Amino acid sequence: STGSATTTPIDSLDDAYITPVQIGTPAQTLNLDFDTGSSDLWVFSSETTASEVDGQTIYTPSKSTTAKLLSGATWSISYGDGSSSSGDVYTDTVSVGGLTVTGQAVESAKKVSSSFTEDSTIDGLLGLAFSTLNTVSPTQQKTFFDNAKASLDSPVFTADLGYHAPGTYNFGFIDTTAYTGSITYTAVSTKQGFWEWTSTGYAVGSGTFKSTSIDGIADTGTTLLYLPATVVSAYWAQVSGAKSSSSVGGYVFPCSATLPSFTFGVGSARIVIPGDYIDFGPISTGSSSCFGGIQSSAGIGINIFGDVALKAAFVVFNGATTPTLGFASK
Ligand SMILES: O=C(CCC1CCCC1)N1CCNCC1
Ligand SMILES: O=C(CCC1CCCC1)N1CCNCC1
């Protein structure tokens, strides 16, 4: 089997992307944030505290003839931006882009933190990291990809995110028309539960490539690119007036600037992030100070190849017995 679904940015600056997911019988379609950096499929629901729902579409398990309460199971997840969500668990039929999994754990939120209530366009998350990170207790549950894997034509999914435009998540096949050149594959460590890999270095604009190992995660659920402070300083030094602001929590730059590109290495291959992908717009409405898309990871503990980086590539998440990642230009 295979599946293919379009993923759409929530706003004009790609602050997050959403993909329609069918849950239950008859289907209830929710728009979920596909997150290769976590491993829970959780949704706003009829069980979510009413004051914490503000425009999201909810899953109502009582209206699904295939829903079954997973007795005694609870979940709780805290994310690195200070947000959180928790609740109970159903199993139900879940389909993405024509690919169907029966008995998928659907984690129904009883509580969500403000950043989730405030994101009216995101009805939940669909985790695509390794199932060892799934938070369901006392019986850990498998991700949608883990459940689908054996049925897929090939045990892979691909992320093809667009810059200020829709893109595609495919399951079970590699669309050879969706990229240019060749896909370069690189080793993955699953030891921390992530699609963790080591970039071979970077370049700023037309500058020379610096060969240096940068360990980080491929995280569709992260919007920006988080790299070591040395690398980030070298990038922003090429933008007149750019500075790290203590009030903003990171690098800002004059909105009048033209940003240089940023290149990262995948083995001997190179992925070029155009400068415009690094512009996240005014810090507040009407400001001439703009949010940078490359930020320091120093306070995170790991580097994060988020959407800023991934949207410059066609990315293969190869879930074979020994997982690997593939990157191609497009
Ligand atoms: O990219 C982030 C926060 C990333 C943080 C960096 C380190 C910890 C997490 N998003 C996506 C958009 N919704 C809010 C959360
Ligand atoms: O903060 C995290 C980790 C989430 C934890 C790991 C699994 C359980 C919770 N991020 C940033 C946002 N994208 C996903 C990765």
Same fold, 5-174 and 175-330: yes
CB 51 within 8 A of CB 37: no
Q: Which ligand has the nearest atom to the CA of 78?
A: 2
**Ligand closest to the CA atom of residue 133:** 2
Technique used = X-ray
What is the distance in A from the centroid of ligand 1 to the CA of 219?
10
Helix (H), strand (E) at residue 185 = strand 184-187
99-112 vs 41-43, strand pairing mode: parallel
Atom 15 (ligand 2): residue with closest C-alpha? 37
Q: Which atom of ligand 2 is nearest to the CA of 39?
A: 7
CA angle 120–122–127, rounded 5-degree value: 160
Going by C-beta distance under 8 Å and a sequence separation of 6 or more, which residues neighbour residue 175? 158, 160, 168
The DSSP secondary structure of 68-97, one letter per residue, reads EEEEEEEEEEE-TTS-EEEEEEEEEEEEET
Burial 20-43 (b: 16+ CB within 10 A, else e): bbbbbeeebebbbbbbbbbbbbbb
Q: Any idea what DSSP says for residue 138?
A: S
Counting ligands in written order, the one closest to the CA of 291 is 1
- For residue 81 and ligand 1, the question of a CB distance below 6 A is answered with yes
Sequence ranges of the domains in the chain: 5-174, 175-330
With H, G, I as helix, E, B as strand and everything else as coil, classify residue 270: strand
Q: What is the dihedral of CA 181, 36, 167, 205, to 10 degrees?
A: -50
The answer to whether residues 328 and 183 touch, using CB atoms and an 8 Å cutoff, is: yes
Q: Which of 39, 85, 108, 199 is catalytic?
A: 199
Q: Is the CB of 223 under 6 A from ligand 1?
A: yes
Tokens for 22, please give them.
């069918």
SS3 content of the chain, % helix, strand, coil (to 5): 10, 45, 45
Architecture of domain 5-174: Beta Barrel (2.40)
* Ligand 1 center–CA 121 separation, angstroms: 16
Which ligand neighbours the alpha carbon of 135 most closely?
2
Distances (CA, A) of 180 to 96, 264, 330: 26, 17, 5
Q: If residue 231 lies in a helix (H) or strand (E), which one and from where to where?
A: helix 229-236
Q: Which two tokens stand for residue 36?
A: 């290769």
Residue 16, ligand 1, Cβ within 6 A = yes
Gap from CA of 222 to ligand 1 centroid (Å): 5
Is residue 80 in contact with ligand 1, taking CB distance under 6 Å? yes
**Among 79, 120, 295, which is best to mutate for testing ligand 1, by the most ligand atoms less than 8 A from CB?**
79
Reply yes or no on whether 35 is catalytic.
Answer: yes
Atom of ligand 2 at shortest range from CA of 129: 7
- Considering the candidates 14, 33, 35, 307, report the single residue annotated as catalytic: 35
Burial of residue 233 (number of CB atoms within 10 Å: 0-12, 13-18, 19+) = middle
Query: Which residue has its alpha carbon closest to ligand 1 atom 2?
Result: 222
- CA 107–ligand 1 middle distance (angstroms): 20
**Residue 15: left (phi > 0), alpha (psi -120 to 50), or beta?**
alpha
- Give the architecture (CATH level 2) of 175-330: Beta Barrel (2.40)
DSSP 300: T
Are the C-beta atoms of residues 317 and 128 closer than 8 Å to each other?
yes
Calculate how far, in angstroms, residue 37's C-alpha sits from the geometric centre of ligand 2.
5
Q: What is the distance in A from the centroid of ligand 2 to the CA of 80?
A: 6
